Amino acid sequence: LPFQTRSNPIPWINTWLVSQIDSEVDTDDLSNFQL
Amino acid sequence: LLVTKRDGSTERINLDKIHRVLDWAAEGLHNVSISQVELRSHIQFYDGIKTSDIHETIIKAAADLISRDAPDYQYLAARLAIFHLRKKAYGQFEPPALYDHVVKMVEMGKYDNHLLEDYTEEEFKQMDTFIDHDRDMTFSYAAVKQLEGKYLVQNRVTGEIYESAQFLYILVAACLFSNYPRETRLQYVKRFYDAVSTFKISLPTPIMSGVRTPTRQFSSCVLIECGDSLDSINATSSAIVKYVSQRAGIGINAGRIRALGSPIRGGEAFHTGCIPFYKHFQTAVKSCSQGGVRGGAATLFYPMWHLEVESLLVLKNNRGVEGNRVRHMDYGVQINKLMYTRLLKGEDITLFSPSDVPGLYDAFFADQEEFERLYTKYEKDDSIRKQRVKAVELFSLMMQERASTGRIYIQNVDHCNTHSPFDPAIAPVRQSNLCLEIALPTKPLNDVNDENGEIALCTLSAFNLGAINNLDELEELAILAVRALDALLDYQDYPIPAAKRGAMGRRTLGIGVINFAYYLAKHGKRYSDGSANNLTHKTFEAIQYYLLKASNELAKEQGACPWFNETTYAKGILPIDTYKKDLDTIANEPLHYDWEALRESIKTHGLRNSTLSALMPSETSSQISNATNGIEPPRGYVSIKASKDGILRQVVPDYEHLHDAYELLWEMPGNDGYLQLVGIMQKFIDQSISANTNYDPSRFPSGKVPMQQLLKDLLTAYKFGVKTLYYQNTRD
């Protein structure tokens, strides 16, 4: 490569170049819990 | 063709003037394009086009190019906008001298005249040496738009911007320490200016917007308690109106108002319900919410066992007549252990009007034992008007209204007094604020000027966790932050006497954190997996310890707060004693600081401030340092946030290096990992945390979010001692 690494200075050219809630509750499952 | 310069004169159109500016703003930046900005501007030239309109167009163009592939546009658009804002206030890029500017601004009535009374021209020129106007080149675009849109002193009818960013910083430092002794005044002014202008300390909207302006109100949170009387309702409405016009957000506690149908004056009148009064509180807020720094809002609180609770939960939903909807306020449902017990057992919950149950309300907050006694007693009393509801159904309604509206909040009132810095017998917490992170004592008012009432004010600030490189830097930061906020309490004005009484007797402060997600990314930890548990404990221990130590040393210098005896700190109790013991099963990190020696110094010399820590969302203020807001994980690598102009793109800090370390909001499998962290933080936080619950419907079978999960998460939040729950975000 003869030039320094560089980012694309015209990125816009690439356009042209490549073309309701589950209500159910289980209190026993909740009872398996200590506050 | 001709353009119209800023000074009115006209010259031949020259695109090289535009290349120069853009080349300047893009210098040093990686992967930006001068050509892109010019072409994406689609700048339509006409004869006589103003050169100011030209610049605003290329700012918008460069601002919308912020992306993952090109993050550095956040600084290209910022440097362009700073350049634009410099010309808007000064007519040039170079800012004037601090003295010449303050003189002109005090003369225009845009600054407070005390600036000339407290500082001499020799002192002002000495603070102009503190200023580094090149720190304007460290902002991101989102930061600059918040400065232009909210913070920088401006005219709200002209749109005329009056000051630069570094003048805002240095004068906030000058004013807050203006009342300091000459021997250490400019010493602190410089040190605090450096702290906030280099993003070690985050300052909230009212401080950024107001500290240096004539109208002195800088407390973000106003907490008003309403009694069950027209004189209190009138006083509450008047206090809301006063403080909403003063950059403040309101928290209303209308749980005492008797239910619909209750007798008035022994049956001379029929009580039409709470909702007609809630509508009055809403129009109080909305009457003068907008027009100032931003649109104020308010959150109303009521106990879950209230009789009208089934009608208050649905106040924000659209499906109903306007007579039964108060949509434009948020609501916080107050719950204690007994209410959750009824849910876990599948039993019922009895609803009372607070007027029919003597002492039941005060016990709901102060005395958890006495409440259960009165509750079951009144449940069996047949002479008391009551209403039984299946706890499974009442909770489903609330969590369902929390889901659809997103603004139905929850405050576990028993945790806010069992693990609080206040004695529930002396000064219980019966309320929270707009964003559910403030918990301070209140007493309702009889008049607008009732001396015996108490309105709770909290002044805020944040530590930038990304800005520190070692936790011991907080010791120095906590001193600077606490001192600045405490002197602010004496410096500002109080439109309501009862509010000044609370602010002066308790001197409550609320210092939080920002950039927490970037902080976990720098440590290679995540929210959900639980890898941040022990790190979070180590981090927030240092925060609270150095905050207490800073205010404890300040109590030595100027004396503890007048009502310090009402605090649990006065009795020698620390957060390390009253925290929720379930946290010990999710964190084995030990304490690292000498808490017992701090306990002795507090027992002896007291605390200048009754509260110090509270984790607020920092929705706007955190954007100044491009930090991830509060403790919430960023929504994306490039986040979309709102402003008065339009949408803003905000890159996560240090994106190029840490895009893998970040766990984005919707990359989290659930709330259990996050909620544990909030509980661990709450072990040390004086007040509360604006904790969000998040749900991705696509992560659930049949695409519907189960009520089982909404309740299981609400319980795991209480299990780890979480005081309050803020937003519930639902994806898409």
Ligand SMILES: Nc1nc2c(ncn2[C@H]2C[C@H](O)[C@@H](COP(=O)(O)OP(=O)(O)OP(=O)(O)O)O2)c(=O)[nH]1
């Ligand atoms: N709908 C309706 N509500 C009222 C009326 N008068 C008072 N209220 C409400 C406001 C308060 O929440 C509650 C108590 O009102 P006050 O405490 O100002 O009335 P007062 O002390 O004269 O009688 P009290 O024995 O406390 O009911 O009733 C009325 O004429 N209509």
Ligand SMILES: Nc1ncnc2c1ncn2[C@@H]1O[C@H](COP(=O)(O)OP(=O)(O)O)[C@@H](O)[C@H]1O
């Ligand atoms: N839209 C608003 N209007 C009025 N006050 C607000 C608003 N948003 C937040 N506040 C106040 O600021 C406090 C903390 O919220 P936060 O997001 O940290 O504010 P900021 O936007 O200044 O960072 C809240 O408790 C509330 O009192």
Ligand SMILES: Nc1ncnc2c1ncn2[C@H]1C[C@H](O)[C@@H](COP(=O)(O)OP(=O)(O)O)O1
């Ligand atoms: N003759 C010209 N034709 C087109 N654009 C111009 C111009 N002169 C200046 N500009 C651009 C450069 C800046 O980005 C923008 C306004 O910047 P400025 O330096 O504050 O304005 P001015 O030079 O008109 O006082 O307008």
Ligand SMILES: [Mg+2]
């Ligand atoms: Mg020029």
Ligand SMILES: [Mg+2]
């Ligand atoms: Mg009365």
